[PDB]
């Protein structure tokens, strides 16, 4: 149980110190992507939400392979703009409905600290 609150301002700084193990101790879903949409990290809680096996999707493209329902201007378009601009910090509600019971969630997308990495944070609403 790692104590970090969804939406926290210096969230990117706190999560820089964590590893795959410690990521699994978060109260919310966490996904780390590269600039092309590929999945680098995927924690235990996210799996709990989507039914995905954390390890089986690392390496896959989130927008093309794993989450086609986010391939839209409302999700993917926002991501591509932040990557192009090098800045991204947006929160919105979204429905996940691919191969799963339609699930309303809150998404927080933010640029990570390191190189070309981006966080996708998810909790139930
Ligand atoms: C739509 O396809 C939305 C979300 C989503 C996120 C993660 C995984 O693994 C599947 C689907």
Swiss-Prot record:
Keyword list, A-Z: Chromophore, Photoreceptor protein, Receptor, Sensory transduction
CDD domains: PAS (cd00130)
PAS domain span: 23-86
PTM section of the record: The 4-hydroxycinnamic acid (p-coumaric acid) chromophore is covalently bound via a thioester linkage.
Pfam family, one: PAS
Stated role: Photoactive blue light protein. Probably functions as a photoreceptor for a negative phototaxis response.
Record-given protein name: Photoactive yellow protein
Native organism: Halorhodospira halophila (Ectothiorhodospira halophila)
């Amino acid at each position: 149980m790692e104590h970090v609150a969804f939406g926290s301002e210096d969230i990117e700084n706190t999560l820089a110190k964590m590893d795959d193990g410690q990521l699994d101790g978060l109260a919310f879903g966490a996904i780390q992507l590269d600039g092309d949409g590929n999945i680098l990290q995927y924690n235990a809680a996210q799996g709990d939400i989507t039914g995905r096996d954390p390890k089986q999707v690392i390496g896959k493209n989130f927008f093309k392979d794993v989450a086609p329902c986010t391939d839209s201007p409302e999700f993917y378009g926002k991501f591509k703009e932040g990557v192009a601009s090098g800045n991204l910090n947006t929160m919105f509600e979204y429905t996940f409905d691919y191969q799963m019971t339609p699930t309303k969630v809150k998404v927080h997308m933010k640029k990570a600290l390191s190189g070309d990495s981006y966080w996708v944070f998810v909790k139930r609403v």
